[PDB]
């Protein structure tokens, strides 16, 4: 018969940053 | 013969929030 | 006898992006 199935993968790696911030209000 | 690979893994988690945003305008 | 067990399974996906950083700090 055919093996069993593997073990499920490892979850994803993080995703990349975010992008910068908006500028500050005036001031 | 070998068992079929596992199942494909989790998708990773969200990214870092981005760094700050520049100072706002002068006045 | 049966087969061994296949390989584990992919990688995850790498996670979504994060979200922008805060606004920048006063003018």
Chains 1, 2, 3 share one sequence.
Do not use: D, I, L, S
Request: charged share 15%.
């Amino acid at each position: 018969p055919p093996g069993p199935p593997g073990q499920r993968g490892r979850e994803g790696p993080m995703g990349p940053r975010g992008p910068p911030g908006p500028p500050g209000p005036p001031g």
